[PDB]
Design a protein around this ligand. Structure first.
Ligand code: ADP
Ligand code: MG
Lengths: 213, 370
């Protein structure tokens, strides 16, 4: 969806190339997460080398050059303002992570904020974990201070830590590898002997959610 | 001296026996004016033939009196033969015997009218009608071979072994350089170029023979053309407009290997060559594979001998050499072969003399010629 947004902005400027691979490569290389898009639009007036030039080769095998502009910051903003991307989803990622931890049981909330692990390729934007941490720390401390101001006593607070790590790009595969190495692993699998008795219904029940029956 | 006239569907090749190339090569065309002749004097005629029709073509409706090796317009064919003898060779046809040519599996009426016109209007003393691909084997200097001949109107395979043709194994395909020219007119429209007058068909015929070639692997050349500028070449129209063209350079000739490009059900020229060898007796096939002789202008594409060798090596069993024989003069080899046959000291009993025509009528030709 951030590629379709980059592609749509190249296409609005009528740039020489707006193929999907060129919009993808402009995310991986040119895009980053800013603090605030009206300040960053203003920085693209104040400082001239904020606009990059990207060299792309066409499907029929010739060179092109693309000016890359405000999509550098406005396209990663899709996570922090999803009203840019969609009519149907509205809650920004720092508020959405707050809703996960505040719906979760009270005794685990420090642990869930103390270790916010990032995963999957689309978390790799420059400054992404820092924008998530600062905006979630703002939400969390404003909620704690509403309580300190009613009670007349300072809290211990909570540390919000967003964690970017060397295996973040493929964390699901590296976890799957680490968990399948366990001596017990073959006992958690469906065996084909289970499938010979019960068929594909053996896999139907939800693992993650609470089931009725 | 005898005359040799190879009545091609697209070009006349004509000359004398014992010469090493045709004296006359010109379009097998009659043109008539299609516009208002407002100006008196100035050298006009009601009709034009060959190179005159080709030079004046902007003002003429051109047509060929030959369709698929059959004469469809005899009054225009008389004008082409008259131009051949009196204008282009500059001979009285009453003084010289004439060797003519046709494709195998033609209508018998084609050969009857062609012998009748030659005795009864050109007053020729003696004449003969050879099979074009039997003449191409004389030019090659061979007694055995399978000859793929493809001209303007027909493609045909005739296998010959030790001087005997196998008439049941002869294959004919009414697809050659006219069908490739018309398919190039079709696919030039998808690049945005419209060619529709019979004069514009002659421009596309010239684009075909300066720019088209046979791809050794078609599906790899399609991928190469879809991903490169290096395939593309340019041509100057008579207008000084420059066209540019790409995969259409090898899609046009690939119709010989895929006749379904023009909506034909036929097998390709590699399959009909192999089917013709496989209709022959099992002992002769080894020497036919080693002597695949190519002839006529539709065999002149760059890379066609190499694709033909690749494809027939993929049909045949791997233990014997497939050799495609593609002379640099193969565009004239039917006429060269007629010059040899009419010059051979053993052939002078085989002419139809007018004395035989005077008692038998035009049906004489079916018992004097193969
Ligand atoms: N160099 C060439 N490359 C491709 N096509 C050619 C070439 N030279 C001639 N042709 C084509 O072959 C035909 C002329 O060859 P020719 O053997 O003289 O045919 P025909 O005897 O039947 O008149 C025409 O259809 C012409 O378009
Ligand atoms: Mg011919």
């Amino acid at each position: 969806d951030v590629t379709y947004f980059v592609q749509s902005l190249l296409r609005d400027r009528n740039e020489p190339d707006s193929s999907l691979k060129t919009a993808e490569r402009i995310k991986e290389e040119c895009c980053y997460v800013c603090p605030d898009i009206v300040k960053e639009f203003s920085r693209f007036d104040r400082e001239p080398d904020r606009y990059l030039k990207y060299a792309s080769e066409s499907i029929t095998g010739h060179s092109t050059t693309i000016d890359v502009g405000f999509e550098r910051f406005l396209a990663p903003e899709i996570f922090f303002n999803p009203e840019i991307a969609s009519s149907d989803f509205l809650t920004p990622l720092p508020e959405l992570v707050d809703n996960v931890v505040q719906s979760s049981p009270i005794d685990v909330r420090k642990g869930l904020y103390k270790n916010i692990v990032l995963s999957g390729g689309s978390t790799l934007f420059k400054n992404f974990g820092n924008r998530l941490q600062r905006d979630l720390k703002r939400i969390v401390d404003e909620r704690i201070h509403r309580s300190e101001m009613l009670s007349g006593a300072k809290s211990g607070g909570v540390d919000v830590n967003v964690i970017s790590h060397k295996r973040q790009r493929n964390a699901v595969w590296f976890g799957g590898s680490l968990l399948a190495q366990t001596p017990e692993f073959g006992s958690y699998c469906h065996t084909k002997a289970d499938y010979e008795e019960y068929g594909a219904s053996i896999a139907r029940r939800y693992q993650i959610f609470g089931n009725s029956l | 001296t005898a005359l040799v006239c190879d009545n091609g569907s697209g070009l006349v090749k004509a000359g004398f026996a014992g010469d090493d190339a045709p004296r006359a090569v010109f379009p097998s065309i009659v043109g008539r004016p299609r516009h208002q002749g407002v100006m008196v004097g100035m050298g006009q005629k009601d009709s034009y033939v060959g190179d005159e029709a080709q030079s004046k073509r902007g003002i003429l409706t051109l047509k060929y009196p030959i369709e698929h090796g059959i004469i469809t317009n005899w009054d225009d064919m008389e004008k082409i033969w008259h131009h051949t003898f009196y204008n282009e060779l500059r001979v009285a046809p009453e003084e010289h015997p004439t060797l003519l040519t046709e494709a195998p599996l033609n209508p018998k009426a084609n050969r009857e009218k062609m012998t009748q016109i030659m005795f009864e209007t050109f007053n020729v003393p003696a004449m003969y009608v050879a099979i074009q691909a039997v003449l191409s084997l004389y030019a090659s200097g061979r007694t055995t071979g399978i000859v793929l001949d493809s001209g303007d109107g027909v493609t045909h395979n005739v296998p010959i072994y030790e001087g005997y043709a196998l008439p049941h194994a002869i294959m004919r395909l009414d697809l050659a350089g006219r069908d490739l020219t018309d398919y190039l007119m079709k696919i030039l429209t998808e690049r945005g170029y419209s060619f529709v007058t019979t004069a514009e068909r002659e421009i596309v015929r010239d684009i075909k023979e300066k720019l088209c070639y046979v791809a050794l692997d078609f599906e790899n050349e399609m991928a190469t053309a879809a991903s490169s500028s290096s395939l593309e070449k340019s041509y100057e129209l008579p207008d000084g407009q420059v066209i540019t063209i790409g995969n259409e350079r090898f899609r046009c000739p690939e119709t010989l290997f895929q006749p379904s490009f023009i909506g034909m059900e036929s097998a390709g020229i590699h399959e009909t060559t192999y089917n013709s060898i496989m209709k022959c007796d099992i002992d002769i096939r080894k020497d036919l594979y080693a002597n695949n002789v190519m002839s006529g202008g539709t065999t002149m594409y760059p890379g066609i001998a190499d694709r033909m060798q690749k494809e027939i090596t993929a049909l045949a069993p791997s233990t014997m050499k497939i050799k495609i024989i593609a002379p640099p003069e193969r565009k004239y080899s039917v006429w060269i072969g007629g010059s040899i046959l009419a010059s051979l000291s053993t052939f002078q009993q085989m002419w139809i003399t007018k004395q035989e025509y005077d008692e038998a009528g035009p049906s004489i030709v079916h018992r004097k010629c193969f």
